[model samples]
Target: GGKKKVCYYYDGDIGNYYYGQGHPMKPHRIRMTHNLLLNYGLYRKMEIYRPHKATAEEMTKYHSDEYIKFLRSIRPDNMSEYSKQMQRFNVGEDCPVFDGLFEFCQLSTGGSVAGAVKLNRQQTDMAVNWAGGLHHAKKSEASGFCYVNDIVLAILELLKYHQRVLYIDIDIHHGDGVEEAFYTTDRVMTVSFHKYGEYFPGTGDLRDIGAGKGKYYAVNFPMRDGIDDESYGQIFKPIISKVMEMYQPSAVVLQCGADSLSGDRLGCFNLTVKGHAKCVEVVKTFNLPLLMLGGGGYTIRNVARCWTYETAVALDCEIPNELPYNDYFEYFGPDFKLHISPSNMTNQNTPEYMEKIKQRLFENLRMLP
Candidate 1:
């Protein structure tokens, strides 16, 4: 109930490690969001940390050494042949080879692992690694702009000691890697709610529970497009709360992907930033050690705004429904012309299709744990 220590991990180098122009996964996004948070004076409430590069051993905890070696060989400029080879490794096309690809992935992965260390030591109540959350990277493959699955590595680190760890991925795309890593272990329970069916890097089927010791440990509630805040409130909050009550996990990992917000170029669903932030707030109500990570946001400005608002929520500060203070309003004013930036704030005007999905979740998921 007291003021909680909220740690923010970022670095200027995160912007320097971008793919070529026109690539959807812009590494410059880190700088843009950092500048916006500074512009809003949000840093006064928290401590900032520079992200370190992850060691090969640290990355190998979840990724295979051969896959890591393959990424080391391919550079952004000359990747045609590597791309062909990467097809077997699942690294090409969807996750194009980028400049300093391994460097950026290591930095993000390090930040996420560092957060796990701090949380384990009780140095912080809540830690956020926005540069992290490369959830699609597999043990031997890179997919969906993720070369290393940092979220999986972080949870594996925590799982070393904690008996029960719950991972909630709210990304527009399913969290394939995190689910896959602990897919057969009851020690980790992964709950993913994403825009399913034909979505990029899609694999979160409703019935793909974990195998062996992890049977029923993997849960997915695939929603249709245009899901609103009320729908999330009715379906997500109730079911997730129930899981928390049942599992009583020692720590929780939340992948708050801003791409789920409306008007996203890549995201087909229509949950606003408010809806996304509410999900974070619900997690905090459990008052467990929490690690938050960013995942899959394409719209640059909206991505910054969504995470900025999430930072406010994590700190327990009252963030108005409107945009935080900024002088760049003139440059960004046109983007907010929707009166409320239909992407950041939901008016609770639920669309017909989204309503049906919400009903289905409420009716179906309610019966499960």
Candidate 2:
């Protein structure tokens, strides 16, 4: 029950980069979260490290050489230079080629990959990288405004020292890229809880467990809209607690995607800040060498609050609910508080549905070693 040693990884410029004019994915929110961390005094509780920018060769560990080459060379002004492969890599629209695109990937991903190494070496009990967790990128193609699969690269680094790694995603969208990457392996098990009604990537079915050797290892808990804290915790605590008991992971990587929070511009789940951070709190109880990451959260303000609270959760620190003065204080307008309320959207995930979902997922776990 002692205090955990926590190290935070952040790039100072991670918030400056833009994802284009109308794109819902905003990197600036990460900066807002970082700012909240500073004003909340959470920054003083841990070892803060500005992560190293990843090299093309390091990103290539889980990505293809040609793909990495495209990212390395494609600039915002040089779209015509990369003609056909733009669509092939799916970079133009959803995964836009913004200024400093490659560098943003390198910096954000660098934190995650580096965080994994920290966990591997036991340098810290928990590593938080709010810049990483761009979970939609594939090995050779980009998807969902994500050009690089930083989460995958991070888990691979963890696997170097850990016998088995547990990857959890609480983002509203499915962690399809990470799941697809390790779908055939048993070394890394992915458990994703996401909105599944014709969602962005259109995956995360309960039946869509792992494949081949990874069968039953890849767990999916699909939810409908309006899953508040109680509904979320009802399943999250039991299932995650069961995951720790059964899988017995050597290390943990959690994608703390804040879009799952209520009132997200791109999300439908009605989870409050407390409900969302409860996921982090639940995983923290596991006490594994934990790597916490940022994922999708379109509503930037909520994203900032969620992650700042989560960083406190990881450090086992406490802060007041009243808004702390910061550069982004205006963003938390009206409420001026840390926690926000969920929308009144009807929760479609009924008790019977949750019971059935748990039964099926538990059945799959029964088949695991």
Choose the strongest candidate by lDDT.
Answer: 2
lDDT of candidates 1 onward, in order? 0.79, 0.90
Q: What global local distance difference test value does model 2 have? A: 0.90
- State the lDDT of candidate 2 residue by residue for 133-209, as single tens digits: 98999999999888889999999999889989999999999999999999999999999999998788998888998
Summarize candidate 1's per-residue lDDT along 1-369 as a digit string, tens digits: 656898889977898886666778877666777777776677999889987888888988878888888877887566776756678787657777766888888889988998998898888888899899888888888888888989988998888768999999998888988999999988998998887777777698877877888877888877777776677777678778768866679999999888888877788767777788889889988889899999888877777778877888899876554555554444346644211334444333345644565455445434445
Report how far residue 322 has shifted in candidate 1, in Å: 6.0
Clashing pairs in 1: none
In candidate 1 the C-alpha lDDT for residue 40 amounts to 63
Worst 10-residue lDDT window, candidate 2: 278-287
